[PDB]
Amino acid sequence: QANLMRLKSDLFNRSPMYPGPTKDDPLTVTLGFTLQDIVKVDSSTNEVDLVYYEQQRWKLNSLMWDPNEYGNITDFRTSAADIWTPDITAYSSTRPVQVLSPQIAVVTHDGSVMFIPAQRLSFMCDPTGVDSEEGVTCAVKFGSWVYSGFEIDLKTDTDQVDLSSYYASSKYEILSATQTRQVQHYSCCPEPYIDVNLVVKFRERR
Amino acid sequence: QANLMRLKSDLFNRSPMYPGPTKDDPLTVTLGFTLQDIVKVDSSTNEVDLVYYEQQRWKLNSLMWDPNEYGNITDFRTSAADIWTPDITAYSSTRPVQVLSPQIAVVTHDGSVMFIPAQRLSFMCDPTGVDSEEGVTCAVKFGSWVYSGFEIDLKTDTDQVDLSSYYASSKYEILSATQTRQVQHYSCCPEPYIDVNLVVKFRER
Amino acid sequence: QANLMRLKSDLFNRSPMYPGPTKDDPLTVTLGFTLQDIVKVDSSTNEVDLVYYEQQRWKLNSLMWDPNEYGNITDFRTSAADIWTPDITAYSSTRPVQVLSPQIAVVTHDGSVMFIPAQRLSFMCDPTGVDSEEGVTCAVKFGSWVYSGFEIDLKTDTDQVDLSSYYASSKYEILSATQTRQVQHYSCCPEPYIDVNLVVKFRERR
Amino acid sequence: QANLMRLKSDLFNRSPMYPGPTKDDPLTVTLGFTLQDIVKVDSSTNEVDLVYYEQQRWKLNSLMWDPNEYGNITDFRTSAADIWTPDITAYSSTRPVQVLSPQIAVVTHDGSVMFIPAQRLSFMCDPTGVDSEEGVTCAVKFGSWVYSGFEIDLKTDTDQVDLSSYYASSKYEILSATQTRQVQHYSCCPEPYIDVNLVVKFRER
Amino acid sequence: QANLMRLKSDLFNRSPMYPGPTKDDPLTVTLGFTLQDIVKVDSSTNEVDLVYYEQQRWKLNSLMWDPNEYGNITDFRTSAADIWTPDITAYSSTRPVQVLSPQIAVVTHDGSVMFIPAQRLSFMCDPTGVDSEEGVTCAVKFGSWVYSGFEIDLKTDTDQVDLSSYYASSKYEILSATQTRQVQHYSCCPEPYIDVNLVVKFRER
Ligand SMILES: *[C@@H]1O[C@H](CO)[C@@H](O[C@@H]2O[C@H](CO)[C@@H](O)[C@H](O)[C@H]2NC(C)=O)[C@H](O)[C@H]1NC(C)=O
Ligand SMILES: *[C@@H]1O[C@H](CO)[C@@H](O[C@@H]2O[C@H](CO)[C@@H](O)[C@H](O)[C@H]2NC(C)=O)[C@H](O)[C@H]1NC(C)=O
Ligand SMILES: O=C1C[C@@H]2OCC=C3CN4CC[C@]56c7ccccc7N1[C@H]5[C@H]2[C@H]3C[C@H]46
Ligand SMILES: O=C1C[C@@H]2OCC=C3CN4CC[C@]56c7ccccc7N1[C@H]5[C@H]2[C@H]3C[C@H]46
Ligand SMILES: O=C1C[C@@H]2OCC=C3CN4CC[C@]56c7ccccc7N1[C@H]5[C@H]2[C@H]3C[C@H]46
Ligand SMILES: O=C1C[C@@H]2OCC=C3CN4CC[C@]56c7ccccc7N1[C@H]5[C@H]2[C@H]3C[C@H]46
Ligand SMILES: O=C1C[C@@H]2OCC=C3CN4CC[C@]56c7ccccc7N1[C@H]5[C@H]2[C@H]3C[C@H]46
Ligand SMILES: *[C@@H]1O[C@H](CO)[C@@H](O)[C@H](O)[C@H]1NC(C)=O
């Protein structure tokens, strides 16, 4: 209690919040998806709804401490409002993303942060052929809304979407689900933009 | 008024809020459900909606006081924003949980806290067989979102879900409802996670 | 303007907010309902939606003042956030209550407060038989969420729900509407809890 | 920039917000509606949905300044949170009113304020006869929620609702739309209440 | 980190926020739309839903800095709450606009700001004829809610709406989409108001 209180006071009250990365001091953010459910499909609007956990990890020098100086504390939990978080956004959502979990992050003594919001997302997807044996493929890109590849580098720990928590009695079964880093250039602008392309192949079950 | 004002000032203004548990100083949180209604079932999306009260109890040394020092006050009510509260979350919700009651907790002189949010929850459930006599069983786990079993231990006072306030004219009748502590390990994570599994067997009326 | 500004400053900035009642210093809260409309019925979910005004009144010594000391002001209006308000809640709602009026209360020099939120409420009600001549009866209890009868006493000024503002062209006509104080005990806990039971008998029009 | 910053600092940081009117110092608020669209009708619930702009004007001595003292500034725009605003409310809404415009007001050197929220409103209305040539008439009163006629006087600049921005391809055409000051007493209350009654006659194509 | 922290502290903590433009010091805001999808059409209410990115650009002297003084930083990203933003609003929305992107802007050393909110908008549109080969045309104006043309000038970089990100498998195909500056006068008021008129011609695929 007392040690943790002192640590949080030192990290958060005695210094300003991290202002985000720059060209000079870029930040790597790792993303991974855990797909829980394809909740619904809307063939009249071509919108599909997913529920997933989006794991985000990054590391800041300003969040480092020595466990010996603070009662051997190697990590703690704190409100996501206490710290900077990356602006990772679905590019083709049709509704505001709905948050299903509390906004709390885990901070480790090496300055690494793990933040894993559960979300429900409606996104642009033609579900025609979902009732067939081949099923249907849909895709949605996630990236920083305003940081280029010079400020934020996105990576994945794996190209496989974690399906170990997928709901066994969903209306839809997953045939494949991948998460792939893409570099993108746009005609206006010189700098590269990074996204992770979440590609899901699915169909109605049996 | 004056005594209570002084107590709240001492507990909340004159010291920092409890920062949450650690490996060294873990916290036990007791959970209990009162199921009020199965409001609806959606066979096109496999989502079911429940209304329930979720009682949460825990105890902190930092919330202790001597009643004699504060006008014989043995307990008080306060906004949940004034205190730390646990991050207990349904694992398989499909919509943000909707809160139906005001966010107020009861604090007792021994440092124990009782907080009982009424909630409406949409969660993943295949309702196939709800129209049958056998009915259907659905389950949803509740636990801390980011604290492991090393920091937060969950328990129940009983394995029976309180059904005494269940809505008599619901579209669905309850055949059974249980609440059971589970210890879980994951491929992701080395540390154990504790949840309470709410299992409800029901059918159409 | 100047006198009222000074009064509000004295009551709200120069002292802490009332911390709520206790066993030693209980508070009586008077409730009355004005039923405006039965807006809808849902026979697939057994939910009914009402629109009403819920008048709440109570009195605090801490909100007293002498009109002579403050430019002859006998009352004022203020945001409900400036003052303590009771945690009166429907026991059997199925959705969060929707507030239709601004959150403003009237405070009188004797310390009495009048707060009258207009609300739309979805609550548990089987509407089977609403299309019949006998109609249907539904009920919903309102009480403090966490204060017992030792801290908050609820009363009504009358057992009749005010129907003078009921919408003349509603889909549903009201046969009766009553509001009755009840004392209740629950198996766990020694202390009594007070509620007001709103009972409404209605049917389809004409 | 610099002059305006100084003016806002003098008006808002150097003095308290206006606390609202009293019996001794009543306030006149002028209302006017611009009806944009009758968006929908629900004959199963007797709810109708309108989109309109509600112009509100009032004048306070505390918001006066001399333009010469502040770089010739005769008016400025500011967040509605910086100032007091009246609690004008539809009496027969069935859903919380939805705000479609940013909450910003215009303040003029004579202390006059203009605030014009665009809103979508669902209100109690039987639409039976909307498909006929005569159409249907519906009405909704707007007034202060908690100030009586002793504290706030409402007026209109005109009895005609502005229809110049009405959506030409709406599902519903407007036959007439009026806005009329009414004085009212209630069984509850000794003091008179002022409202503006918005009466709209409309029909399908 | 350290240089950027100092820059933000200098710009945002050590001086007041920009209070908005005046007649004396007007501001030009450039708008451009990127239409992503016509998501739905409602022929029972004459409402259509679009998803788009609205790029907004303006320039303030108060946001200028010398890169040499701050570690060669030529630009940074910051929360839109840290800075003033224009009150650009759709004139004919039927629901509050839904924001799909985080509220973050890019600020450049010359004081220029780029802010690009992704939005879902329901607006007044008769979709009769959408199933035909000619299709249907709908329009919606965007402008400042309370600043006139004397305080805020709107312009476009181009009259063509960017369709390069339009969703290939939308139910609706775009025949044309234009964005055009308009000057407007209103009977009440002496001052001109500027808007950008977004005109979209589309049909079923
Ligand atoms: C924090 O942890 C370190 C070890 O992980 C502790 O340091 C050791 O304490 C043991 C047991 O008393 C000694 O025998 C070792 O010599 C110490 N050093 C090392 C490097 O192992 C330390 O005492 C812990 N601190 C607290 C307050 O619990
Ligand atoms: C409060 O009320 C008293 C009277 O009840 C006001 O004082 C009187 O003011 C009138 C003019 O309005 C004078 O002619 C009287 O001589 C005053 N009498 C006394 C005893 O003071 C007083 O002005 C009121 N306060 C206000 C309006 O702020
Ligand atoms: O030109 C583009 C299109 C592209 O759209 C998909 C979403 C993206 C997320 N943000 C939103 C704005 C954007 C951007 C920034 C700077 C120049 C061009 C540009 N955009 C989008 C772009 C990506 C990346 C970035
Ligand atoms: O990927 C998972 C699966 C599992 O999901 C059920 C809920 C859990 C409670 N919290 C939420 C995040 C989670 C966790 C932490 C770190 C990596 C992966 C991960 N999760 C969930 C997990 C448990 C434990 C933990
Ligand atoms: O045990 C209960 C059930 C009962 O539910 C109906 C509604 C009530 C209003 N509040 C909500 C919490 C509650 C309460 C307080 C303390 C211990 C148990 C307890 N609850 C509910 C109770 C009443 C009274 C009170
Ligand atoms: O009983 C009523 C009905 C009537 O409703 C129309 C609107 C009004 C404006 N405010 C809102 C609350 C109200 C009022 C005050 C005290 C007791 C009952 C009561 N109401 C409304 C009333 C008027 C006047 C007042
Ligand atoms: O008289 C009007 C109608 C017109 O409506 C289209 C939208 C507009 C954008 N803002 C919103 C308020 C408004 C305006 C300013 C001052 C008095 C009246 C008034 N309005 C609207 C007007 C334009 C311009 C401006
Ligand atoms: C900034 O640019 C100058 C000029 O090239 C260079 O000398 C300096 O090292 C750069 N970096 C910093 C942090 O000032």
PDB file of N, CA and C in Angstrom, chain E residues 71-93:
ATOM      1  N   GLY E  71      14.694  21.029 -30.021  1.00  0.00           N
ATOM      2  CA  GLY E  71      15.243  19.748 -30.481  1.00  0.00           C
ATOM      3  C   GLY E  71      14.963  19.356 -31.920  1.00  0.00           C
ATOM      4  N   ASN E  72      14.784  20.348 -32.795  1.00  0.00           N
ATOM      5  CA  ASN E  72      14.425  20.135 -34.219  1.00  0.00           C
ATOM      6  C   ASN E  72      13.015  19.561 -34.488  1.00  0.00           C
ATOM      7  N   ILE E  73      12.135  19.598 -33.486  1.00  0.00           N
ATOM      8  CA  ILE E  73      10.738  19.148 -33.646  1.00  0.00           C
ATOM      9  C   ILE E  73      10.004  20.089 -34.610  1.00  0.00           C
ATOM     10  N   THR E  74       9.553  19.543 -35.737  1.00  0.00           N
ATOM     11  CA  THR E  74       8.772  20.303 -36.719  1.00  0.00           C
ATOM     12  C   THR E  74       7.244  20.117 -36.586  1.00  0.00           C
ATOM     13  N   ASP E  75       6.821  19.036 -35.934  1.00  0.00           N
ATOM     14  CA  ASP E  75       5.402  18.810 -35.639  1.00  0.00           C
ATOM     15  C   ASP E  75       5.166  17.822 -34.498  1.00  0.00           C
ATOM     16  N   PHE E  76       3.968  17.880 -33.933  1.00  0.00           N
ATOM     17  CA  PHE E  76       3.556  16.928 -32.911  1.00  0.00           C
ATOM     18  C   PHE E  76       2.055  16.661 -32.948  1.00  0.00           C
ATOM     19  N   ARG E  77       1.663  15.606 -32.243  1.00  0.00           N
ATOM     20  CA  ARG E  77       0.278  15.179 -32.137  1.00  0.00           C
ATOM     21  C   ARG E  77      -0.185  15.540 -30.751  1.00  0.00           C
ATOM     22  N   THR E  78      -1.411  16.023 -30.632  1.00  0.00           N
ATOM     23  CA  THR E  78      -1.975  16.325 -29.324  1.00  0.00           C
ATOM     24  C   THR E  78      -3.494  16.168 -29.322  1.00  0.00           C
ATOM     25  N   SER E  79      -4.030  15.909 -28.142  1.00  0.00           N
ATOM     26  CA  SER E  79      -5.464  15.847 -27.916  1.00  0.00           C
ATOM     27  C   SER E  79      -6.119  17.145 -28.389  1.00  0.00           C
ATOM     28  N   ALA E  80      -7.243  17.018 -29.068  1.00  0.00           N
ATOM     29  CA  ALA E  80      -7.996  18.177 -29.556  1.00  0.00           C
ATOM     30  C   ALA E  80      -8.535  19.065 -28.425  1.00  0.00           C
ATOM     31  N   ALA E  81      -8.630  18.526 -27.207  1.00  0.00           N
ATOM     32  CA  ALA E  81      -8.999  19.308 -26.023  1.00  0.00           C
ATOM     33  C   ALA E  81      -7.932  20.325 -25.614  1.00  0.00           C
ATOM     34  N   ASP E  82      -6.671  20.046 -25.936  1.00  0.00           N
ATOM     35  CA  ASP E  82      -5.563  20.994 -25.683  1.00  0.00           C
ATOM     36  C   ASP E  82      -5.631  22.290 -26.489  1.00  0.00           C
ATOM     37  N   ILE E  83      -6.336  22.266 -27.622  1.00  0.00           N
ATOM     38  CA  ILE E  83      -6.382  23.408 -28.541  1.00  0.00           C
ATOM     39  C   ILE E  83      -7.808  23.839 -28.857  1.00  0.00           C
ATOM     40  N   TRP E  84      -7.932  25.057 -29.374  1.00  0.00           N
ATOM     41  CA  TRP E  84      -9.179  25.515 -29.957  1.00  0.00           C
ATOM     42  C   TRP E  84      -9.435  24.724 -31.234  1.00  0.00           C
ATOM     43  N   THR E  85     -10.709  24.413 -31.478  1.00  0.00           N
ATOM     44  CA  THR E  85     -11.124  23.798 -32.742  1.00  0.00           C
ATOM     45  C   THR E  85     -12.385  24.499 -33.244  1.00  0.00           C
ATOM     46  N   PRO E  86     -12.558  24.553 -34.575  1.00  0.00           N
ATOM     47  CA  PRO E  86     -13.741  25.218 -35.124  1.00  0.00           C
ATOM     48  C   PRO E  86     -15.034  24.430 -34.910  1.00  0.00           C
ATOM     49  N   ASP E  87     -16.142  25.160 -34.820  1.00  0.00           N
ATOM     50  CA  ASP E  87     -17.484  24.610 -34.559  1.00  0.00           C
ATOM     51  C   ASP E  87     -18.259  24.239 -35.853  1.00  0.00           C
ATOM     52  N   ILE E  88     -17.602  23.500 -36.728  1.00  0.00           N
ATOM     53  CA  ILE E  88     -18.149  23.105 -38.018  1.00  0.00           C
ATOM     54  C   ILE E  88     -19.198  22.035 -37.788  1.00  0.00           C
ATOM     55  N   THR E  89     -20.394  22.256 -38.315  1.00  0.00           N
ATOM     56  CA  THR E  89     -21.564  21.447 -37.978  1.00  0.00           C
ATOM     57  C   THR E  89     -22.369  21.209 -39.237  1.00  0.00           C
ATOM     58  N   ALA E  90     -22.904  20.005 -39.379  1.00  0.00           N
ATOM     59  CA  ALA E  90     -23.855  19.726 -40.448  1.00  0.00           C
ATOM     60  C   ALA E  90     -25.148  20.478 -40.127  1.00  0.00           C
ATOM     61  N   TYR E  91     -25.731  21.127 -41.122  1.00  0.00           N
ATOM     62  CA  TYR E  91     -26.940  21.927 -40.907  1.00  0.00           C
ATOM     63  C   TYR E  91     -28.207  21.088 -40.847  1.00  0.00           C
ATOM     64  N   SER E  92     -28.196  19.912 -41.455  1.00  0.00           N
ATOM     65  CA  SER E  92     -29.423  19.124 -41.623  1.00  0.00           C
ATOM     66  C   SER E  92     -29.293  17.681 -41.097  1.00  0.00           C
ATOM     67  N   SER E  93     -28.479  17.492 -40.056  1.00  0.00           N
ATOM     68  CA  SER E  93     -28.423  16.226 -39.360  1.00  0.00           C
ATOM     69  C   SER E  93     -29.753  15.963 -38.647  1.00  0.00           C
TER      70      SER E  93
END
